[PDB]
Design a protein around this nucleic acid. Structure first.
Lengths: 73, 106, 83, 80, 434, 162, 167, 82
RNA sequence: GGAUUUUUGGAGCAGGGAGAUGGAAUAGGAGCUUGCUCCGUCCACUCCACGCAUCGACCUGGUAUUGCAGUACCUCCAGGAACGGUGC
């Protein structure tokens, strides 16, 4: 029962690796103690270099086992 | 010591080949310009020399390693069981002998 | 209750560690912020993605749910957990 | 009630565990806790396409097990 | 070296030590049954040590037949004797003795203090040869073949009676199809059983029993070992009948007896060896399987305490006249109160002055000695040992303080107008300056 | 003096210099090579610093071995059954040893796994074409006298002594 | 001297791990291998250190391997100026120390004099400076370390040599 | 009970989520039982992808590894306690 | 206290095609053993689309550094792919 420490990373850019080998490039926007980091301006990155802007991805920590930083925040 | 034991081994090698009671390979070694300190019978080493001679004889009997070799030992645990039981029977008779001798002396 | 595993994770956070994840995503770097739920924040890390092009990123959020293991300070072998 | 408590009726008990990594092992486990935690002993284990590997004191997990086989002299209703 | 002589020397030492060890091991014994099985194995293995000696000595003619003619001369002597002795007259002034010239075979083939094993006898035992309940020769492993048969047949009533009946008999009409892999499974259970038997009869000639069993497999089954009165001759490993003995033989080497059936004379070779070994092992252990079955009946019907353990096999203080002490008096003396004396092996005392005198009583004295701190009064009533050690620590410091030590206090000027202590003064004095 | 499994179990089996499992037995002068497999498949290096082992022999079946120290020893020859008992073996460091003649290089070649070797301080050292014999007999070798092997050396060592 | 021994002057086209394997094979002989501190950054390239169990072990590997051939150039090994982090977390009986520092710390002087089987005591002559007299509870130890210290470096600005005290 | 609490402090081969064996001188347990394996290494199958090439294992050592609770398939002892 | 981070599980599975190319001694079926024909598990060579790229370690020779500090891993050019998993 403890929220996660995305606190200075919020409203900033992360490039995330979720299951299916997929990537979500986006802004940290919203979460729950369930770690469900929700990315707006988030775009998919497939196996091939194809990428689609998804509008607002509420990407559950159910799969996303990685995400790297674009800046220092 | 290893040197004295080697000298006793040479004494056994000479007692295996001494073919006459007055002629051998050690009659020369006794008074032939060298030391001969195992040649004494009044030395206690004479007894170890006699044991080494018994060993050389156990190697010099034709059934002991000259030209015939029996495999009832090299592949024989049944004859080995027979021999164990034979040693044990000799031991039982000997225990009886010791008990009877102790009783008689007492 | 509270895990000496979590005490080990707290002694392994803050400096260079090397986490290893499910599909081979292994990040060797400053495992800055790890919470007892193990969602490890690494900093200035070199992560392989099992891809052998083990490239260096910054401030990654490597979850611990996929974490196969985590190489920690070799200096705390005399931990207070085991002692 | 659960059958975790039925598997709690196993100590000095000849069992056979088919575990999660294609494993199949004969084992007299050491002691099993409420979350199925049943540590093996003198166990002959063979995962998928394996050998009869021996563990004299091993700790077989819970949710990483698949199937359990109890003794033959084991009264079922008395074990649950 | 000495080959036709020293080789026989080594062989005589080996066989003689082996014969002494064999006589002792086969005359005296022990109480243990696992030890008895291992010791029968060890008597067989001592025969085997004499056996290596004999395998070296019985074909050892490559030195004898050739050196008996060169050493068969009657002319030479002190010449070669002097070559040898002048080589032997090197500097052997190394004044020490060696009993490791004759004193090996006793430590090789004798008994030990904790496990009666010789130089070889570091791992001599029934270590892996005895399972949990098997008992080194008390029970056997029928559970594994039983589990294999269970997984094969899958019968809702393949229970104790059926198992024991299939595993006791020799060659009845079997309770499972031998024309399937059940025969091979019986052969595997028989391989385990035959290993058990080769461990349970270790003093018998293993190779000779093997040769007898080989003559058995090669003549005693197929040359009319089972007579009859279809009934003249038939096979339990072939499943072909004979109008007579000649018909049986002729169908042995006919076309359909050569390669025209997957159960042919060679196409049933593995299952046939399995059947033969199983029948022989069962018909030998008709008493052993019987004792194991009696044991199993006990392990099925015996009570829980016996079965498990065999598988695992008013406070009133005294008066001078030894009665209760009455209650107001007990309250006065206050025995209820107990004192945890940690120094005394966590001894705990009732009665307060009792407690106190204990500090000079023995158990406390011992406690002190082994604590590493004398039983002086200064610690009496300090019962915890870390307190005791820090107390005696500062006490030590104070005793060393108030000691006058001339080494550090008593101090000496050298001649050169500068001063040192007694110690350093004498140090540099007697190491050549002062 | 008896070298036992006392001194092999009490030996140190832990992180070596190159971060491998090493088992040191320094300070025994152990001349007896027995009772070793009781490293229990958790060892790759067997070290006998300060030993007097009459030659190179006496090891158990170790399919894992990755380093062995037989330096400061009494190695005179080289025993036969080394490869099947050390197939993972590349480091058998037998410097400060007393190998003499190239007949002590007879089992040296039968290994397929030898790359990091040392037999330094032996009278087989200053002999002419000794490193030539070595670079002939050791195909898969990479570390010889702590400097790389050479294809020119291999050409010399194969071509000579036909 | 130091138990941490410097081992350098080899090639750089060789690897850190590979040269570590070579150094282990060639160092378990002259000393013990505790840890090989090897950095192949540019500020300290082509060099490493081995932390041996004994200081005389390290200096003896240095004095025997005083230019031993290896890895592209004969490698030179000496004692270090200090010791490594593992060991950091861890003829007569009396002899005059000449070139005895008027600056040395009695602690390190004691660890020097007790390199040998325990020394009796060291007495740095506190009158006319630059002299000492050290005695060892084992005279063979005194003579051993005093002969091996003839010309010994301590505070390398000088060589601290101890000979048998005279009559 | 805490079964492993006797067998800890020795080099123990812990099994993986993917079938490796990792002999670490195991320390301690939990309710999730996440492993803290000290002096710990790993080794897994170097698959030849063929049969005329044979199967081995390349040596990896993490030292002290904090194996997350989702790891263990088993825990056996492969080294006595040093 | 079996629901998005650890213990009631997403685990299982299968290796791309072909040539009058070949090995199964002790092991496959039928043509009712031998001979010979066709048939449902691999590897060695060769053809494609060395199953395709990255990078890492290494073998090859040349090549820059003489230097003190606690390491994911520290030269550069060029070849080869003996080895690893990442996208199809």
């Amino acid at each position: 029962a403890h929220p996660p420490e995305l606190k200075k990373f919020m409203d900033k850019k992360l490039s995330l690796k979720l299951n299916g080998g997929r990537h979500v490039q986006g802004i940290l926007r919203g979460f729950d103690p369930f770690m469900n980091l929700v990315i707006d301006e988030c775009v998919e990155m497939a196996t091939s270099g194809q990428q689609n802007n998804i509008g607002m991805v509420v990407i559950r920590g159910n799969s996303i086992i990685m995400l790297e930083a674009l800046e220092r925040v | 010591s290893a040197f004295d034991l080697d000298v006793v081994k040479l004494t056994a090698q000479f007692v295996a080949r001494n073919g006459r009671q007055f002629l051998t390979q050690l009659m020369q070694k006794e008074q032939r310009n060298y030391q001969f300190d195992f040649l004494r019978p009044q030395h206690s080493l004479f007894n170890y020399f006699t044991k080494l001679v018994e060993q050389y004889t156990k190697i010099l009997i034709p059934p002991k390693g000259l030209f015939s070799k029996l495999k009832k030992e090299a592949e024989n645990p049944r004859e080995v069981l027979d021999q164990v039981c034979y040693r044990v029977e000799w031991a039982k008779f000997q225990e009886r002998e010791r008990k009877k001798e102790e009783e008689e002396k007492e | 209750s509270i895990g000496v595993p979590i005490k080990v994770l707290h002694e392994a956070e803050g400096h260079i560690v090397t986490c290893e994840t499910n599909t081979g995503e292994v990040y060797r770097g400053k495992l800055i912020e790890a919470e007892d739920n193990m969602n490890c924040q690494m900093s200035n890390i070199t992560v392989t993605y099992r891809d052998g092009r083990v490239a260096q990123l910054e401030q990654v959020y490597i979850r611990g749910s996929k974490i196969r293991f985590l190489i920690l300070p070799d200096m705390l072998k005399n931990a207070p957990m085991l002692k | 009630m659960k059958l975790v408590r039925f598997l709690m009726k196993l100590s000095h008990e000849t069992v056979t565990i088919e575990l999660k990594n294609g494993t199949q092992v004969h084992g007299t486990i050491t002691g099993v806790d409420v979350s199925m935690n049943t540590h093996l002993k003198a166990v002959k284990m063979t995962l998928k396409n394996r050998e009869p590997v021996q563990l004299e004191t091993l700790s077989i997990r819970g949710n990483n097990i698949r199937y359990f086989i109890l003794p033959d002299s084991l009264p079922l209703d008395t074990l649950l | 070296m000495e080959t036709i002589l020293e080789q026989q020397r080594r062989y005589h030492e080996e066989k003689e030590r082996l014969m002494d060890v064999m006589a002792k091991e086969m005359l005296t014994k022990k109480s243990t049954l696992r030890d008895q099985i291992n010791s029968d194995h060890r008597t067989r293995a001592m025969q085997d040590r004499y056996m290596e000696v004999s395998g070296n000595l019985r074909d050892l003619y490559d030195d004898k037949d050739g050196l008996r003619k060169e050493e068969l001369n009657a002319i030479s002597g002190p010449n070669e004797f002097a070559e040898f002795y002048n080589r032997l007259k090197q500097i052997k002034e190394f004044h020490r003795k060696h009993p490791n010239e004759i004193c090996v075979p006793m430590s090789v083939e004798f008994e030990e203090l904790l496990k009666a094993r010789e130089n070889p006898s570091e791992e001599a035992q029934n270590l892996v040869e005895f399972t949990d309940e098997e008992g080194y020769g008390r029970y056997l492993d029928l559970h594994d073949c039983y589990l294999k048969y269970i997984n094969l047949k899958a019968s809702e009533k393949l229970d104790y009676i059926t198992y024991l009946s299939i595993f006791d008999q020799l060659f009845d009409i079997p309770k499972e199809r031998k024309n399937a892999e059940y025969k091979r499974y019986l052969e595997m259970l028989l391989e385990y059983l035959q290993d058990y038997t080769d461990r349970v009869k270790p003093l018998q000639d293993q190779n000779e029993l093997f040769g007898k069993i080989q003559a058995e497999f090669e003549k005693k089954w197929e040359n009319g070992t089972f007579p009859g009165w279809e009934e003249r001759a038939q096979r339990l490993f072939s499943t072909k009948g004979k109008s007579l003995e000649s018909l049986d033989t002729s169908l042995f080497a006919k076309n359909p007896k050569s390669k025209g059936t997957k159960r042919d004379t060679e196409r049933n070779k593995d299952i046939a060896f399995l059947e033969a070994q199983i029948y022989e092992y069962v018909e030998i252990l008709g008493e052993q399987r019987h004792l194991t079955h009696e044991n199993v009946q006990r392990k099925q019907a015996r009570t829980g305490e016996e079965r498990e353990e065999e598988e695992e096999e008013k406070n009133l203080p005294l008066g001078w006249d030894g009665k209760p002490i009455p209650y107001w008096l007990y309250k006065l003396h206050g025995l209820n109160i107990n004192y945890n004396c940690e120094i005394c092996g966590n001894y705990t005392y009732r009665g307060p002055k009792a407690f106190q005198r204990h500090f000079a009583e023995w158990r406390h004295a011992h406690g002190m000695r082994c604590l590493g701190i004398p039983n002086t009064a200064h610690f009496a009533n300090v019962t915890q040992i870390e307190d005791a050690v820090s107390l005696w620590a500062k006490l030590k410091l104070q005793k060393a303080s108030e000691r006058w030590q001339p080494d550090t206090e008593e101090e000496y000027e050298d001649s050169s107008g500068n001063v040192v202590n007694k110690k350093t003064y004498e140090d540099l004095k007697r190491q050549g300056l002062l | 003096v008896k070298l036992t499994a006392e001194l092999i179990e009490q030996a140190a089996q832990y992180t070596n210099a190159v971060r491998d499992r090493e088992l040191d037995l320094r300070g025994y002068k152990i001349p007896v090579i027995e009772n070793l497999g009781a490293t229990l498949d958790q060892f790759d290096a067997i070290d006998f610093s300060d030993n007097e082992i009459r030659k190179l022999d006496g090891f158990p079946l170790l399919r894992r071995l990755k380093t062995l120290l037989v330096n400061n020893n009494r190695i005179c020859r080289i025993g036969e059954g080394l490869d099947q008992a050390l197939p993972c073996l590349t480091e058998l460091i037998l410097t400060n040893n007393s190998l003499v003649e190239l007949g002590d290089l007879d089992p040296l070649a039968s290994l397929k796994s030898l790359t990091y070797l040392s037999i330094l301080r032996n009278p087989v050292t200053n002999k002419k074409h000794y490193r030539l014999y070595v670079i002939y007999k050791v195909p898969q070798v990479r570390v010889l006298d702590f400097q790389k092997v050479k294809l020119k050396e291999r050409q010399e060592a194969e071509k000579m002594f036909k | 001297p130091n138990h941490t021994i410097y081992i350098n002057n080899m090639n750089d086209k060789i690897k850190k791990e590979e040269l570590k394997r070579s150094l282990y094979a060639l160092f378990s002989q002259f000393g013990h291998v505790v840890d090989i501190v090897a950095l192949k950054t540019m500020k300290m390239r082509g060099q490493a250190f081995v932390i041996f169990k004994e200081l005389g072990s390290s200096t003896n590997a240095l004095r025997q391997l005083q230019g031993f051939p290896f890895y592209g150039k004969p490698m030179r090994i000496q004692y270090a100026k200090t010791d490594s982090d593992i060991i950091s977390k861890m003829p007569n009986y009396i002899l005059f120390l000449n070139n005895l520092p008027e600056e040395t710390n009695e602690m390190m002087l004691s660890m020097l004099f007790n390199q040998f089987p325990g020394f009796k005591e060291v007495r740095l002559v506190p009158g006319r400076h630059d002299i000492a007299f050290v005695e060892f509870e084992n005279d063979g130890q005194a003579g051993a370390a005093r002969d091996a210290l003839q010309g010994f470096k301590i505070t390398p600005s000088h060589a601290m040599k101890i000979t048998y005290a005279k009559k | 009970s805490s079964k492993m609490l006797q067998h800890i402090d020795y080099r123990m081969r812990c099994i993986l989520q993917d079938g490796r064996i990792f002999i670490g001188t195991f320390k301690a347990f939990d309710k999730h039982m996440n492993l803290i394996l000290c002096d710990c290494d790993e080794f897994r199958k170097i698959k030849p992808k063929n049969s005329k090439q044979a199967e081995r294992e390349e040596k990896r050592v993490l030292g002290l590894v904090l194996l997350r609770g989702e790891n263990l398939v088993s825990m056996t002892v492969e080294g006595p306690p040093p």
